[PDB]
Ligand binder design. Structure first.
Ligand SMILES: N[C@@H](CCC(=O)N[C@@H](CS)C(=O)NCC(=O)O)C(=O)O
Ligand SMILES: [Ca+2]
Ligand SMILES: [Ca+2]
Ligand SMILES: [Ca+2]
Ligand SMILES: [Ca+2]
Ligand SMILES: [Ca+2]
Ligand SMILES: [Ca+2]
Ligand SMILES: [Ca+2]
Ligand SMILES: [Cl-]
Ligand SMILES: [Cl-]
Ligand SMILES: [Cl-]
Length: 317
């Protein structure tokens, strides 16, 4: 006439830690009760009750208190597997005892940081100030504690960009120049579990495009400061003299050039504003000598100019 008692004697409840992902059949906890009596009166049958939540645990067999994994548990869904163990003798009116079990699920680092976008992109002007934040990348991590802390890095900022390891803010580290490099495709990395060994850290990367927009910061240039040419005396107006060509490193209208003439010979010559072709406006006589100023002006606002000099001598036929 003794009721089964759980061991150790007077135990209020059982508890054990269980790693999430424990495979089915894995022993989660083993409990035991005793009944001093003889035969069926002292033969103990174990059952489980009130599985909260259900589906994750079962007794290996009803003859013992070994509890094994059924479905695998996910810490991201379940923090506690609670249930009751009933230990019943097999007597005529049976006597039984019941006790709670609390299995404490333990997080493992089974989720990677995952970026909130498939890629990132911004456009910035080439004169953007050093230190300016361009964009923020964000990843999220479904684990807990250190396993969900994220450290951002750039695989290679090229000395032009830097990322804040906490915020994911990508900033200008040194001055840009569209003319040197007009866009960047950077790899940003999110790595969890800071401070642990490389093998227990998970990561993902994403590509970040920064397109560098033009400012009109390059003036038109000629190849040298002095050109020289000759025109025959007594040639008609419209006679070709020379074609002038300047360069400009900017983009679009910022490097679209128009030519003009300046100074004491402008009236005797003309330059086609688009082609750079210089022609005479009249016949020249052999004594005449001109040092013209040729100007190339870009289409920026305000425009930039560059000049060169053009010596024109008139030769006898
Ligand atoms: N040093 C200045 C000007 C740089 C710049 O814009 N240079 C132009 C010409 S105006 C260029 O062609 N840069 C290309 C290079 O240096 O390779 C800056 O850093 O802003
Ligand atoms: Ca008994
Ligand atoms: Ca999990
Ligand atoms: Ca993680
Ligand atoms: Ca986890
Ligand atoms: Ca530039
Ligand atoms: Ca320009
Ligand atoms: Ca430019
Ligand atoms: Cl900008
Ligand atoms: Cl910081
Ligand atoms: Cl680009």
């Amino acid at each position: 006439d003794n009721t089964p008692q759980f061991k150790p004697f007077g135990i209020t409840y059982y508890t054990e830690r269980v790693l999430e992902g424990a495979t089915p059949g894995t022993t989660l906890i083993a409990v035991a009760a005793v009944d001093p009596d003889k035969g069926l009166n002292g033969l103990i049958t174990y059952t489980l009750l009130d599985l909260t939540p259900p589906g994750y645990v079962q007794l290996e067999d009803s003859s013992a208190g070994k509890v094994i994994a059924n479905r695998t548990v996910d810490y991201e869904e379940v923090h506690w597997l609670n249930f009751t163990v009933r230990a019943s003798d097999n007597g005529s009116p049976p006597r039984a005892a019941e006790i709670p079990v609390y299995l404490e699920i333990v997080d493992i680092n089974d989720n990677n940081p995952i970026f909130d976008q498939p890629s990132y992109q911004e456009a910035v002007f080439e004169d953007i100030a050093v230190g300016t934040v361009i964009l923020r990348v964000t990843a999220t991590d479904a684990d807990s504690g250190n396993f969900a802390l994220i450290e951002y890095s750039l695989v290679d900022g090229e000395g032009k960009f830097a990322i804040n390891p906490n915020t994911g803010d990508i900033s200008v580290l040194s001055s840009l120049d569209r003319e040197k490099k007009d866009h960047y495709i950077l790899t940003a990395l999110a790595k969890d579990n800071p401070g642990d060994v490389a093998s227990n850290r998970r990561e993902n990367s994403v590509q970040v495009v920064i397109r560098v927009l033009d400012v009109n910061d390059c003036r038109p240039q000629f190849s040298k400061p002095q050109f020289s040419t000759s025109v025959y005396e007594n040639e008609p107006a419209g006679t070709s003299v020379i074609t002038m060509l300047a360069t400009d490193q900017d983009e679009g209208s910022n490097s679209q050039l128009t030519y003009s003439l300046e100074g004491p010979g402008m009236e005797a010559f003309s330059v086609d504003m688009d082609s750079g072709l210089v022609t005479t406006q009249r016949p020249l006589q052999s004594y005449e000598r001109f040092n013209l100023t040729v100007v190339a002006t870009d289409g920026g606002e305000p425009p930039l100019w560059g000049t060169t000099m053009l010596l024109v001598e008139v030769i006898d036929v």
